Amino acid sequence: NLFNVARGNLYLVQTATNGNWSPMAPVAAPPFVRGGPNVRVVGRFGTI
């Protein structure tokens, strides 16, 4: 992190929060993981 490189994955949820916020160290729980319930992995090329 001293060399402007972050480890770990990246979330793109929205939140309309007014209070404190920190993308570096989010105190709250992650919204989901890869093997979790109702979550699904996209295939190759993201075909809509």
Binding site: F45, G46, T47, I48
Partner: protein
């Protein structure tokens, strides 16, 4: 782009994209570069295209 249908970008459900999504990924480029001498041109490459 015409050489390598495996390198296609498949944005939407094109009917071509219905076919090109079935493409096995490691079926592309060279497979056996049968070279003999380092620094000299390879004798016989073996590529899928």
């Amino acid at each position: 782009a015409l050489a390598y249908p495996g390198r296609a970008v498949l944005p939407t459900q094109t009917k071509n994209a219905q076919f090109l999504s079935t493409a096995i990924a490691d079926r592309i480029g060279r497979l056996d570069r049968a070279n003999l001498i380092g620094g000299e041109v390879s004798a016989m490459v073996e590529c899928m295209e």
